[PDB]
Swiss-Prot record, chain A:
Residues 27-52, 220-271 are annotated as: Disordered. The keyword Acetylation applies. The keyword Acetylation applies. This is Large ribosomal subunit protein uL2. One of its GO terms (biological process) is negative regulation of DNA-templated DNA replication initiation. SMART domains: Ribosomal_L2, Ribosomal_L2_C. Keywords: Acetylation, Ribonucleoprotein, Ribosomal protein, RNA-binding, rRNA-binding. It comes from Escherichia coli (strain K12). The lineage of its organism: Bacteria, Pseudomonadati, Pseudomonadota, Gammaproteobacteria, Enterobacterales. InterPro entries: NA-bd_OB-fold, Rib_uL2_dom2, Ribosomal_uL2, Ribosomal_uL2_bac/org-type, Ribosomal_uL2_C, Ribosomal_uL2_CS, Ribosomal_uL2_dom3, Ribosomal_uL2_RNA-bd_dom.
Swiss-Prot record, chain B:
It comes from Escherichia coli (strain K12). Changing residue 17 to Q: Strongly reduces trigger factor binding. Keywords: Ribonucleoprotein, Ribosomal protein, RNA-binding, rRNA-binding. PROSITE patterns: RIBOSOMAL_L23. Belongs to the universal ribosomal protein uL23 family. HAMAP family: Ribosomal_uL23_B (MF_01369_B). One of the early assembly proteins, it binds 23S rRNA; is essential for growth. One of the proteins that surround the polypeptide exit tunnel on the outside of the subunit. Acts as the docking site for trigger factor for Ffh binding to the ribosome (SRP54) and to nascent polypeptide chains. Changing residue 17 to A: Binds normally to ribosomes; strongly reduces trigger factor binding. This is Large ribosomal subunit protein uL23. Part of the 50S ribosomal subunit. Contacts protein L29 and trigger factor. Might also contact SecE and probably does contact SecG and SecY when the SecYEG translocation complex is docked with the ribosome. One of its GO terms (cellular component) is cytoplasm. Pfam families: Ribosomal_L23 (PF00276). The gene is rplW.
Swiss-Prot record, chain C:
HAMAP family: Ribosomal_bL34. This is Large ribosomal subunit protein bL34. GO terms for cellular component: cytoplasm; cytosolic large ribosomal subunit. GO terms for biological process: cytoplasmic translation. Part of the 50S ribosomal subunit. It comes from Escherichia coli (strain K12). It comes from the Bacteria. Belongs to the bacterial ribosomal protein bL34 family. GO terms for molecular function: structural constituent of ribosome. InterPro entries: Ribosomal_bL34, Ribosomal_bL34_CS. Transmembrane segments: none annotated. The gene is rpmH.
Amino acid sequence: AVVKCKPTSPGRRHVVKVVNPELHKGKPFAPLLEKNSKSGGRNNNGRITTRHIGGGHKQAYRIVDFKRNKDGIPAVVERLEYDPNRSANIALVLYKDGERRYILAPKGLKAGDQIQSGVDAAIKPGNTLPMRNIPVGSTVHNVEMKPGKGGQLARSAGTYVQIVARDGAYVTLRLRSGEMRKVEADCRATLGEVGNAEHMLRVLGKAGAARWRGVRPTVRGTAMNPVDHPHGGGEGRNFGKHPVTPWGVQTKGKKTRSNKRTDKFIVRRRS
Amino acid sequence: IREERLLKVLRAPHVSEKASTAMEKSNTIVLKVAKDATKAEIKAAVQKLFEVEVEVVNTLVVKGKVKRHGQRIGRRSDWKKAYVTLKEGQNL
Amino acid sequence: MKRTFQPSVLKRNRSHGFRARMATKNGRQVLARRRAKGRARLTVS
RNA sequence: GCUCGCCGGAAGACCAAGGGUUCCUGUCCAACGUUAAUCGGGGCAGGGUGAGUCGACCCCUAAGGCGAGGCCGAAAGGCGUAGUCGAUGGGAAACAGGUUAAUAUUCCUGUACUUGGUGUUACUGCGAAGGGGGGACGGAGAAGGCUAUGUUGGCCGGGCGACGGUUGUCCCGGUUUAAGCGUGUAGGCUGGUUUUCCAGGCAAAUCCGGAAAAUCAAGGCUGAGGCGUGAUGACGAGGCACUACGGUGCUGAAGCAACAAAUGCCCUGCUUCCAGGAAAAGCCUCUAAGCAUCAGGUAACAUCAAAUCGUACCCCAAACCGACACAGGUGGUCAGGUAGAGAAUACCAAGGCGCUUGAGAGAACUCGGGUGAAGGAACUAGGCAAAAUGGUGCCGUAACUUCGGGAGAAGGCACGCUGAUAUGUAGGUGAGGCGACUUGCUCGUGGAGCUGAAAUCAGUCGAAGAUACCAGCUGGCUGCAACUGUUUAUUAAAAACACAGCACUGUGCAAACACGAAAGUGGACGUAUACGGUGUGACGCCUGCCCGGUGCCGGGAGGUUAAU
RNA sequence: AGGACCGAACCGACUAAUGUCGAAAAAUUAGCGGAUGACUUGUGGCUGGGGGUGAAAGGCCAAUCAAACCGGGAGAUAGCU
Ligand SMILES: [K+]
Ligand SMILES: [K+]
Ligand SMILES: [Mg+2]
Ligand SMILES: [Mg+2]
Ligand SMILES: [Mg+2]
Ligand SMILES: [Mg+2]
Ligand SMILES: [Mg+2]
Ligand SMILES: [Mg+2]
Ligand SMILES: [Mg+2]
Ligand SMILES: [Mg+2]
Ligand SMILES: [Mg+2]
Ligand SMILES: [Mg+2]
Ligand SMILES: [Mg+2]
Ligand SMILES: [Mg+2]
Ligand SMILES: [Mg+2]
Ligand SMILES: [Mg+2]
Ligand SMILES: [Mg+2]
Ligand SMILES: [Mg+2]
Ligand SMILES: [Mg+2]
Ligand SMILES: [Mg+2]
Ligand SMILES: [Mg+2]
Ligand SMILES: [Mg+2]
Ligand SMILES: [Mg+2]
Ligand SMILES: [Mg+2]
Ligand SMILES: [Mg+2]
Ligand SMILES: [Mg+2]
Ligand SMILES: [Mg+2]
Ligand SMILES: [Mg+2]
Ligand SMILES: [Mg+2]
Ligand SMILES: [Mg+2]
Ligand SMILES: [Mg+2]
Ligand SMILES: [Mg+2]
Ligand SMILES: [Mg+2]
Ligand SMILES: [Mg+2]
Ligand SMILES: [Mg+2]
Ligand SMILES: [Mg+2]
Ligand SMILES: [Mg+2]
Ligand SMILES: [Mg+2]
Ligand SMILES: [Mg+2]
Ligand SMILES: [Mg+2]
Ligand SMILES: [Mg+2]
Ligand SMILES: [Mg+2]
Ligand SMILES: [Mg+2]
Ligand SMILES: [Mg+2]
Ligand SMILES: [Mg+2]
Ligand SMILES: [Mg+2]
Ligand SMILES: [Mg+2]
Ligand SMILES: [Mg+2]
Ligand SMILES: [Mg+2]
Ligand SMILES: [Mg+2]
Ligand SMILES: [Mg+2]
Ligand SMILES: [Mg+2]
Ligand SMILES: [Mg+2]
Ligand SMILES: [Mg+2]
Ligand SMILES: [Mg+2]
Ligand SMILES: [Mg+2]
Ligand SMILES: [Mg+2]
Ligand SMILES: [Mg+2]
Ligand SMILES: [Mg+2]
Ligand SMILES: [Mg+2]
Ligand SMILES: [Mg+2]
Ligand SMILES: [Mg+2]
Ligand SMILES: [Mg+2]
Ligand SMILES: [Mg+2]
Ligand SMILES: [Mg+2]
Ligand SMILES: [Mg+2]
Ligand SMILES: [Mg+2]
Ligand SMILES: [Mg+2]
Ligand SMILES: [Mg+2]
Ligand SMILES: [Mg+2]
Ligand SMILES: [Mg+2]
Ligand SMILES: [Mg+2]
Ligand SMILES: [Mg+2]
Ligand SMILES: [Mg+2]
Ligand SMILES: [Mg+2]
Ligand SMILES: [Mg+2]
Ligand SMILES: [Mg+2]
Ligand SMILES: [Mg+2]
Ligand SMILES: [Mg+2]
Ligand SMILES: [Mg+2]
Ligand SMILES: [Mg+2]
Ligand SMILES: [Mg+2]
Ligand SMILES: [Mg+2]
Ligand SMILES: [Mg+2]
Ligand SMILES: [Mg+2]
Ligand SMILES: [Mg+2]
Ligand SMILES: [Mg+2]
Ligand SMILES: [Mg+2]
Ligand SMILES: [Mg+2]
Ligand SMILES: [Mg+2]
Ligand SMILES: [Mg+2]
Ligand SMILES: [Mg+2]
Ligand SMILES: [Mg+2]
Ligand SMILES: [Mg+2]
Ligand SMILES: [Mg+2]
Ligand SMILES: [Mg+2]
Ligand SMILES: [Mg+2]
Ligand SMILES: [Mg+2]
Ligand SMILES: [Mg+2]
Ligand SMILES: [Mg+2]
Ligand SMILES: [Mg+2]
Ligand SMILES: [Mg+2]
Ligand SMILES: [Mg+2]
Ligand SMILES: [Mg+2]
Ligand SMILES: [Mg+2]
Ligand SMILES: [Mg+2]
Ligand SMILES: [Mg+2]
Ligand SMILES: [Mg+2]
Ligand SMILES: [Mg+2]
Ligand SMILES: [Mg+2]
Ligand SMILES: [Mg+2]
Ligand SMILES: [Mg+2]
Ligand SMILES: [Mg+2]
Ligand SMILES: [Mg+2]
Ligand SMILES: [Mg+2]
Ligand SMILES: [Mg+2]
Ligand SMILES: [Mg+2]
Ligand SMILES: [Mg+2]
Ligand SMILES: [Mg+2]
Ligand SMILES: [Mg+2]
Ligand SMILES: [Mg+2]
Ligand SMILES: [Mg+2]
Ligand SMILES: [Mg+2]
Ligand SMILES: [Mg+2]
Ligand SMILES: [Mg+2]
Ligand SMILES: [Mg+2]
Ligand SMILES: [Mg+2]
Ligand SMILES: [Mg+2]
Ligand SMILES: [Mg+2]
Ligand SMILES: [Mg+2]
Ligand SMILES: [Mg+2]
Ligand SMILES: [Mg+2]
Ligand SMILES: [Mg+2]
Ligand SMILES: [Mg+2]
Ligand SMILES: [Mg+2]
Ligand SMILES: [Mg+2]
Ligand SMILES: [Mg+2]
Ligand SMILES: [Mg+2]
Ligand SMILES: [Mg+2]
Ligand SMILES: [Mg+2]
Ligand SMILES: [Mg+2]
Ligand SMILES: [Mg+2]
Ligand SMILES: [Mg+2]
Ligand SMILES: [Mg+2]
Ligand SMILES: [Mg+2]
Ligand SMILES: [Mg+2]
Ligand SMILES: [Mg+2]
Ligand SMILES: [Mg+2]
Ligand SMILES: [Mg+2]
Ligand SMILES: [Mg+2]
Ligand SMILES: [Mg+2]
Ligand SMILES: [Mg+2]
Ligand SMILES: [Mg+2]
Ligand SMILES: [Mg+2]
Ligand SMILES: [Mg+2]
Ligand SMILES: [Mg+2]
Ligand SMILES: [Mg+2]
Ligand SMILES: [Mg+2]
Ligand SMILES: [Mg+2]
Ligand SMILES: [Mg+2]
Ligand SMILES: [Mg+2]
Ligand SMILES: [Mg+2]
Ligand SMILES: [Mg+2]
Ligand SMILES: [Mg+2]
Ligand SMILES: [Mg+2]
Ligand SMILES: [Mg+2]
Ligand SMILES: [Mg+2]
Ligand SMILES: [Mg+2]
Ligand SMILES: [Mg+2]
Ligand SMILES: [Mg+2]
Ligand SMILES: [Mg+2]
Ligand SMILES: [Mg+2]
Ligand SMILES: [Mg+2]
Ligand SMILES: [Mg+2]
Ligand SMILES: [Mg+2]
Ligand SMILES: [Mg+2]
Ligand SMILES: [Mg+2]
Ligand SMILES: [Mg+2]
Ligand SMILES: [Mg+2]
Ligand SMILES: [Mg+2]
Ligand SMILES: [Mg+2]
Ligand SMILES: [Mg+2]
Ligand SMILES: [Mg+2]
Ligand SMILES: [Mg+2]
Ligand SMILES: [Mg+2]
Ligand SMILES: [Mg+2]
Ligand SMILES: [Mg+2]
Ligand SMILES: [Mg+2]
Ligand SMILES: [Mg+2]
Ligand SMILES: [Mg+2]
Ligand SMILES: [Mg+2]
Ligand SMILES: [Mg+2]
Ligand SMILES: [Mg+2]
Ligand SMILES: [Mg+2]
Ligand SMILES: [Mg+2]
Ligand SMILES: [Mg+2]
Ligand SMILES: [Mg+2]
Ligand SMILES: [Mg+2]
Ligand SMILES: [Mg+2]
Ligand SMILES: [Mg+2]
Ligand SMILES: [Mg+2]
Ligand SMILES: [Mg+2]
Ligand SMILES: [Mg+2]
Ligand SMILES: [Mg+2]
Ligand SMILES: [Mg+2]
Ligand SMILES: [Mg+2]
Ligand SMILES: [Mg+2]
Ligand SMILES: [Mg+2]
Ligand SMILES: [Mg+2]
Ligand SMILES: [Mg+2]
Ligand SMILES: [Mg+2]
Ligand SMILES: [Mg+2]
Ligand SMILES: [Mg+2]
Ligand SMILES: [Mg+2]
Ligand SMILES: [Mg+2]
Ligand SMILES: [Mg+2]
Ligand SMILES: [Mg+2]
Ligand SMILES: [Mg+2]
Ligand SMILES: [Mg+2]
Ligand SMILES: [Mg+2]
Ligand SMILES: [Mg+2]
Ligand SMILES: [Mg+2]
Ligand SMILES: [Mg+2]
Ligand SMILES: [Mg+2]
Ligand SMILES: [Mg+2]
Ligand SMILES: [Mg+2]
Ligand SMILES: [Mg+2]
Ligand SMILES: [Mg+2]
Ligand SMILES: [Mg+2]
Ligand SMILES: [Mg+2]
Ligand SMILES: [Mg+2]
Ligand SMILES: [Mg+2]
Ligand SMILES: [Mg+2]
Ligand SMILES: [Mg+2]
Ligand SMILES: [Mg+2]
Ligand SMILES: [Mg+2]
Ligand SMILES: [Mg+2]
Ligand SMILES: [Mg+2]
Ligand SMILES: [Mg+2]
Ligand SMILES: [Mg+2]
Ligand SMILES: [Mg+2]
Ligand SMILES: [Mg+2]
Ligand SMILES: [Mg+2]
Ligand SMILES: [Mg+2]
Ligand SMILES: [Mg+2]
Ligand SMILES: [Mg+2]
Ligand SMILES: [Mg+2]
Ligand SMILES: [Mg+2]
Ligand SMILES: [Mg+2]
Ligand SMILES: [Mg+2]
Ligand SMILES: [Mg+2]
Ligand SMILES: [Mg+2]
Ligand SMILES: [Mg+2]
Ligand SMILES: [Mg+2]
Ligand SMILES: [Mg+2]
Ligand SMILES: [Mg+2]
Ligand SMILES: [Mg+2]
Ligand SMILES: [Mg+2]
Ligand SMILES: [Mg+2]
Ligand SMILES: [Mg+2]
Ligand SMILES: [Mg+2]
Ligand SMILES: [Mg+2]
Ligand SMILES: [Mg+2]
Ligand SMILES: [Mg+2]
Ligand SMILES: [Mg+2]
Ligand SMILES: [Mg+2]
Ligand SMILES: [Mg+2]
Ligand SMILES: [Mg+2]
Ligand SMILES: [Mg+2]
Ligand SMILES: [Mg+2]
Ligand SMILES: [Mg+2]
Ligand SMILES: [Mg+2]
Ligand SMILES: [Mg+2]
Ligand SMILES: [Mg+2]
Ligand SMILES: [Mg+2]
Ligand SMILES: [Mg+2]
Ligand SMILES: [Mg+2]
Ligand SMILES: [Mg+2]
Ligand SMILES: [Mg+2]
Ligand SMILES: [Mg+2]
Ligand SMILES: [Mg+2]
Ligand SMILES: [Mg+2]
Ligand SMILES: [Mg+2]
Ligand SMILES: [Mg+2]
Ligand SMILES: [Mg+2]
Ligand SMILES: [Mg+2]
Ligand SMILES: [Mg+2]
Ligand SMILES: [Mg+2]
Ligand SMILES: [Mg+2]
Ligand SMILES: [Mg+2]
Ligand SMILES: [Mg+2]
Ligand SMILES: [Mg+2]
Ligand SMILES: [Mg+2]
Ligand SMILES: [Mg+2]
Ligand SMILES: [Mg+2]
Ligand SMILES: [Mg+2]
Ligand SMILES: [Mg+2]
Ligand SMILES: [Mg+2]
Ligand SMILES: [Mg+2]
Ligand SMILES: [Mg+2]
Ligand SMILES: [Mg+2]
Ligand SMILES: [Mg+2]
Ligand SMILES: [Mg+2]
Ligand SMILES: [Mg+2]
Ligand SMILES: [Mg+2]
Ligand SMILES: [Mg+2]
């Protein structure tokens, strides 16, 4: 459920929690975990390339399986786990042979359900297939952009691609943006919708909730001096210049798409 | 067992109150050894040159004291001393 | 009330040491200067 | 030497860092010491730092650094792979007592513990650059069991009081003992096995994972503590002994019991919450390449060894950082009594100190305090500054409200001591017993002692009983900012920044964008419920008209239009 | 439970007085704010000068900052004193 917290303190007042009752309460499966040290937004050169990131809670990386390499092998969903490295939840899948892997939990899924993947299989939520084999006009997620790769598109909580059309070797997909992209039919896609759709109704409530998610404070250009940001200076709340990034490029309606290579695949741009 | 070199380890027998008190009561000898000089090399030197039954050798490196001669300051050399314990068959 | 020099021999040598100077093109030139000038304390070490 | 005073969650005791002989003894006061100096952290000699167990080095890693080839870069060199460094983290083992003028978990005595080596011998399959397990982990909270430690009895040795009492419910002092080894408890955690089987853990596996089962219900695991022993010992208050009045060396009494109790220890545990909580070796295990009387494991009596470096002394300071013997700054540990909720505060203990110029006088004036007739903010830019309120329990507490609050609203009253209820009770608490259940650190009766609130009632002293220290001033209207937070180190703490929330906007993943001649990194091991930018700034009610101008976006006919 | 309340340590720096050739190139005394978190702190890293970092003051980058420091061009230049 989406439970609103009672106003016992200012900072608590506005908090809205997404309390999933079906998640596991305990330590995760270690073999799939590994360390994930933080950058703080800095790179090779030790310089802030991405602003406003740094701090937060320490969090380990779960090796989630996007490829779904196991063909013609059934797999029982053992337990749904919380993932700090992701918007969506994950499911500890135990394959019939012996292996265990983490996968993104679709919407219709619980501890006990069985999933199969490969070439044949059945058309059901969670069952990964080649997009050729999937019926046209169906809800998919964890969609590959290249055959044999992991899975790029629709991985966030409540996110899903819809297969619009199927032109021979190619499949026209309508993405969550509204962009209609043409991908290869040999590429795979996990059926259904990505779970944890309540995620968006979470509201943090306090400053520190953003700080313990690893975000840092965003200072407005207008607040700065002219030397710092193009917006800057003025003796008491001035502006009078067109909105811009700290590096002068115009924000607020200014197309930065310039790939050129992959412009053939885009059937129609978003709107 | 390391002939010729053993002779170069032991520099001089140490003289002091602490040196004296550990002769009769504790059955040891305090002595100035080479800056290299391992506990085995001191023991083995005492076992042949002094020719007495060595129980165990303890060692320490004494730091040189910064002296003065009008103007030009000067440090002493970092000599090493070895408390060598002896067995019941003792003498000097 | 807290001054600028807060000593530490590890930091000292890691930063300004002989090997730290030896490491780099420009660091070797510092030594090459102090040797040319003819200093006693070539580096802090 | 004797008083006095001060600190005592330190102004005491240990360290790390940092200093680098400042330590100890003998001597010398020129200079240094804010005065004198016989003294000194000063000068001049000599002495002083003793380790298989403490730390370092060593075996392993994080952040990160370096980086064979490699990719990239006019040169210099940048990035980065297999590796190899890098603790602030992980990995073997020693305590008690005695001792020096100066070191002690290091020397000494009494007891122990670890790992290797090379055997002797009993058996036997071993064996990785490889697999699995372990290491191995967050916040808060709560509860139990303990312990350091205290307090009070008893017990043992001494005391019979300089001024009235004191042979006692009296006084003073003591009542100490470790790691180790044995024991495996308070309690945590987990169904054991036994066999087969299988596209899994790039090979292989008897290990790990999965799947049948059959089959007794427990068997393991971890673990404070206590008890034993260690220890007939060690140690012990005075004595005695000598005196070089320095002490030397000789003896040694009780050496118990309840109660209380940690922020320690079990607990790296349990419950809970989400923001979902390093790594890698040692260690344990399974097999490949191999090896097959072999070498190799195993266990056991040995045996050899456990190298090297630091160890003095200061370490909230006259020894470090501040130019000074500079009221500044500096991480960790130890945490006694009485009052108290307390690591607050007051007075003290251990232990340490009285701050390296003094002696007078007792003007104005300055600084820091105390008291103040009558008035009571009349002061002043402004109640600035002082004065005032203050604790615990109980009764009571308005508009307004986001239904939590405002609120400690407001305002009251009760507080000491002494008897009683009750030769100290509610509780805590637990003994000699007695079942009993078996060999226990037993269950389960049971009420000797210690322990001890909080009340009510009745007295009683003072002017005053939360009597000291300690310890809210309160209420009404209103601007701004929702709020906690951040900010001009060293004249600005705010209405400024941030903020949760809100909108527009870019971004389809070799993402936008950023750092970068580039390779490449970050964004992100993220993928539009995501990410970057911009503005606005919780929440409630809302957010109107203008696209002429500047920008942006789309459109491609026409005009003009570069290189070629 | 809590960017909850009171309040020591710890972190801070609102007011006043003292000091202003200081005890001190920013402190002392008496009150003051936060004090389980957007907290604080030890040890070691990383980011470099038109560059960093900045809950944004032109703050901070070794008592130096609207462009550090050291060496060099260098005896820059000066219709000025
Ligand atoms: K045209
Ligand atoms: K020139
Ligand atoms: Mg791991
Ligand atoms: Mg990263
Ligand atoms: Mg780098
Ligand atoms: Mg670099
Ligand atoms: Mg950016
Ligand atoms: Mg951002
Ligand atoms: Mg994240
Ligand atoms: Mg924002
Ligand atoms: Mg902002
Ligand atoms: Mg903004
Ligand atoms: Mg502003
Ligand atoms: Mg500004
Ligand atoms: Mg900048
Ligand atoms: Mg500009
Ligand atoms: Mg301005
Ligand atoms: Mg201004
Ligand atoms: Mg402005
Ligand atoms: Mg204006
Ligand atoms: Mg205007
Ligand atoms: Mg611009
Ligand atoms: Mg010995
Ligand atoms: Mg010894
Ligand atoms: Mg030594
Ligand atoms: Mg010499
Ligand atoms: Mg200095
Ligand atoms: Mg550094
Ligand atoms: Mg550097
Ligand atoms: Mg280099
Ligand atoms: Mg470099
Ligand atoms: Mg010369
Ligand atoms: Mg020389
Ligand atoms: Mg006192
Ligand atoms: Mg006091
Ligand atoms: Mg104390
Ligand atoms: Mg403390
Ligand atoms: Mg106390
Ligand atoms: Mg001290
Ligand atoms: Mg030291
Ligand atoms: Mg010095
Ligand atoms: Mg000296
Ligand atoms: Mg001396
Ligand atoms: Mg001295
Ligand atoms: Mg003397
Ligand atoms: Mg004299
Ligand atoms: Mg002098
Ligand atoms: Mg003098
Ligand atoms: Mg002076
Ligand atoms: Mg004189
Ligand atoms: Mg002396
Ligand atoms: Mg001296
Ligand atoms: Mg002299
Ligand atoms: Mg030792
Ligand atoms: Mg050693
Ligand atoms: Mg020994
Ligand atoms: Mg050790
Ligand atoms: Mg070594
Ligand atoms: Mg490594
Ligand atoms: Mg790195
Ligand atoms: Mg490199
Ligand atoms: Mg190679
Ligand atoms: Mg190379
Ligand atoms: Mg390449
Ligand atoms: Mg290079
Ligand atoms: Mg080259
Ligand atoms: Mg390089
Ligand atoms: Mg590496
Ligand atoms: Mg290493
Ligand atoms: Mg090292
Ligand atoms: Mg360390
Ligand atoms: Mg360590
Ligand atoms: Mg270690
Ligand atoms: Mg261990
Ligand atoms: Mg070790
Ligand atoms: Mg001493
Ligand atoms: Mg010993
Ligand atoms: Mg003996
Ligand atoms: Mg014995
Ligand atoms: Mg014995
Ligand atoms: Mg032994
Ligand atoms: Mg034994
Ligand atoms: Mg043992
Ligand atoms: Mg052995
Ligand atoms: Mg050998
Ligand atoms: Mg052998
Ligand atoms: Mg052999
Ligand atoms: Mg051999
Ligand atoms: Mg043989
Ligand atoms: Mg034999
Ligand atoms: Mg075997
Ligand atoms: Mg084996
Ligand atoms: Mg292995
Ligand atoms: Mg392993
Ligand atoms: Mg492992
Ligand atoms: Mg750890
Ligand atoms: Mg925890
Ligand atoms: Mg837990
Ligand atoms: Mg915890
Ligand atoms: Mg809790
Ligand atoms: Mg209970
Ligand atoms: Mg209890
Ligand atoms: Mg407790
Ligand atoms: Mg108890
Ligand atoms: Mg006790
Ligand atoms: Mg004890
Ligand atoms: Mg106590
Ligand atoms: Mg005690
Ligand atoms: Mg009592
Ligand atoms: Mg008493
Ligand atoms: Mg008794
Ligand atoms: Mg008697
Ligand atoms: Mg008597
Ligand atoms: Mg009498
Ligand atoms: Mg009397
Ligand atoms: Mg009398
Ligand atoms: Mg009398
Ligand atoms: Mg008494
Ligand atoms: Mg005993
Ligand atoms: Mg004990
Ligand atoms: Mg031990
Ligand atoms: Mg034994
Ligand atoms: Mg047992
Ligand atoms: Mg048992
Ligand atoms: Mg055990
Ligand atoms: Mg039990
Ligand atoms: Mg297999
Ligand atoms: Mg197998
Ligand atoms: Mg086997
Ligand atoms: Mg198996
Ligand atoms: Mg199995
Ligand atoms: Mg025990
Ligand atoms: Mg006993
Ligand atoms: Mg005993
Ligand atoms: Mg006995
Ligand atoms: Mg005896
Ligand atoms: Mg004695
Ligand atoms: Mg007597
Ligand atoms: Mg005797
Ligand atoms: Mg005796
Ligand atoms: Mg006796
Ligand atoms: Mg007697
Ligand atoms: Mg006796
Ligand atoms: Mg006792
Ligand atoms: Mg007892
Ligand atoms: Mg009693
Ligand atoms: Mg007891
Ligand atoms: Mg108790
Ligand atoms: Mg306590
Ligand atoms: Mg605590
Ligand atoms: Mg503690
Ligand atoms: Mg604990
Ligand atoms: Mg391992
Ligand atoms: Mg074995
Ligand atoms: Mg053999
Ligand atoms: Mg083995
Ligand atoms: Mg044995
Ligand atoms: Mg033996
Ligand atoms: Mg031996
Ligand atoms: Mg010491
Ligand atoms: Mg001391
Ligand atoms: Mg201090
Ligand atoms: Mg301290
Ligand atoms: Mg102190
Ligand atoms: Mg001082
Ligand atoms: Mg100064
Ligand atoms: Mg001075
Ligand atoms: Mg002084
Ligand atoms: Mg000083
Ligand atoms: Mg001072
Ligand atoms: Mg430290
Ligand atoms: Mg009492
Ligand atoms: Mg008390
Ligand atoms: Mg009180
Ligand atoms: Mg105090
Ligand atoms: Mg007392
Ligand atoms: Mg005392
Ligand atoms: Mg004194
Ligand atoms: Mg005095
Ligand atoms: Mg004195
Ligand atoms: Mg006169
Ligand atoms: Mg006067
Ligand atoms: Mg006066
Ligand atoms: Mg005054
Ligand atoms: Mg006055
Ligand atoms: Mg006054
Ligand atoms: Mg007064
Ligand atoms: Mg007054
Ligand atoms: Mg008055
Ligand atoms: Mg008056
Ligand atoms: Mg009157
Ligand atoms: Mg009056
Ligand atoms: Mg009045
Ligand atoms: Mg007036
Ligand atoms: Mg007036
Ligand atoms: Mg006025
Ligand atoms: Mg005031
Ligand atoms: Mg007052
Ligand atoms: Mg009062
Ligand atoms: Mg009310
Ligand atoms: Mg009213
Ligand atoms: Mg209320
Ligand atoms: Mg109000
Ligand atoms: Mg109150
Ligand atoms: Mg009240
Ligand atoms: Mg009241
Ligand atoms: Mg009010
Ligand atoms: Mg009131
Ligand atoms: Mg009273
Ligand atoms: Mg009774
Ligand atoms: Mg009574
Ligand atoms: Mg009683
Ligand atoms: Mg009573
Ligand atoms: Mg009774
Ligand atoms: Mg009772
Ligand atoms: Mg009980
Ligand atoms: Mg009982
Ligand atoms: Mg009990
Ligand atoms: Mg009893
Ligand atoms: Mg009993
Ligand atoms: Mg009984
Ligand atoms: Mg009994
Ligand atoms: Mg019985
Ligand atoms: Mg019992
Ligand atoms: Mg019993
Ligand atoms: Mg029972
Ligand atoms: Mg019972
Ligand atoms: Mg009962
Ligand atoms: Mg009773
Ligand atoms: Mg009593
Ligand atoms: Mg009455
Ligand atoms: Mg009367
Ligand atoms: Mg009266
Ligand atoms: Mg009276
Ligand atoms: Mg009163
Ligand atoms: Mg009072
Ligand atoms: Mg009063
Ligand atoms: Mg109060
Ligand atoms: Mg009123
Ligand atoms: Mg009103
Ligand atoms: Mg108004
Ligand atoms: Mg109003
Ligand atoms: Mg107004
Ligand atoms: Mg208004
Ligand atoms: Mg307003
Ligand atoms: Mg505010
Ligand atoms: Mg500040
Ligand atoms: Mg300021
Ligand atoms: Mg300023
Ligand atoms: Mg403020
Ligand atoms: Mg201010
Ligand atoms: Mg706000
Ligand atoms: Mg909304
Ligand atoms: Mg718009
Ligand atoms: Mg959008
Ligand atoms: Mg560039
Ligand atoms: Mg380049
Ligand atoms: Mg690139
Ligand atoms: Mg990247
Ligand atoms: Mg990463
Ligand atoms: Mg703002
Ligand atoms: Mg608004
Ligand atoms: Mg604003
Ligand atoms: Mg409302
Ligand atoms: Mg309109
Ligand atoms: Mg228009
Ligand atoms: Mg028009
Ligand atoms: Mg266009
Ligand atoms: Mg256009
Ligand atoms: Mg167009
Ligand atoms: Mg066109
Ligand atoms: Mg055209
Ligand atoms: Mg033309
Ligand atoms: Mg809390
Ligand atoms: Mg709070
Ligand atoms: Mg608070
Ligand atoms: Mg205090
Ligand atoms: Mg403080
Ligand atoms: Mg501090
Ligand atoms: Mg502070
Ligand atoms: Mg401060
Ligand atoms: Mg201050
Ligand atoms: Mg004021
Ligand atoms: Mg002020
Ligand atoms: Mg003012
Ligand atoms: Mg004042
Ligand atoms: Mg002055
Ligand atoms: Mg203050
Ligand atoms: Mg207060
Ligand atoms: Mg305060
Ligand atoms: Mg507050
Ligand atoms: Mg507070
Ligand atoms: Mg936090
Ligand atoms: Mg450290
Ligand atoms: Mg640092
Ligand atoms: Mg930098
Ligand atoms: Mg510059
Ligand atoms: Mg430059
Ligand atoms: Mg420039
Ligand atoms: Mg900031
Ligand atoms: Mg300005
Ligand atoms: Mg700042
Ligand atoms: Mg410039
Ligand atoms: Mg310069
Ligand atoms: Mg010139
Ligand atoms: Mg000019």
